[PDB]
């Protein structure tokens, strides 16, 4: 019935989106770090093999 109570619940869902977006950004960041490490790990072996 209250409008304030309804206003307090939209701020409950404006953060449930940010949880998901910060989660996908974290997953992409971890995958980028894993790929950069695998690239570095093959380049470092190839230098000694040269």
């Amino acid at each position: 019935v209250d409008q304030r109570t309804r206003d307090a619940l939209q701020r409950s869902v404006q953060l449930a989106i940010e949880i998901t977006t910060n989660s996908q950004e974290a997953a992409a960041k971890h995958e980028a770090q894993r790929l950069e490490q695998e690239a570095r790990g093959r380049l470092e072996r190839q230098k000694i093999l040269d």
Binding site: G41, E44, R45, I48, L49
Partner: protein, 50 residues
């Protein structure tokens, strides 16, 4: 780093042979030149004494 060290072991094996060649060449050259000069001086001194 394990695979990088597995290749680096082989590089360190080859540098051992390179360092062996590079040291024994300098030693052999600087020894044999002075041996030849000493032979020349000895064969000269026999004739000079005659």
């Amino acid at each position: 780093q394990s695979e990088a060290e597995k290749a680096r072991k082989e590089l360190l094996e080859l540098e051992a042979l390179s360092m062996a060649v590079e040291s024994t060449g300098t030693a052999k050259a600087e020894a044999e030149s002075r041996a030849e000069a000493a032979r020349i001086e000895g064969e000269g001194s026999v004739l000079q004494a005659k």
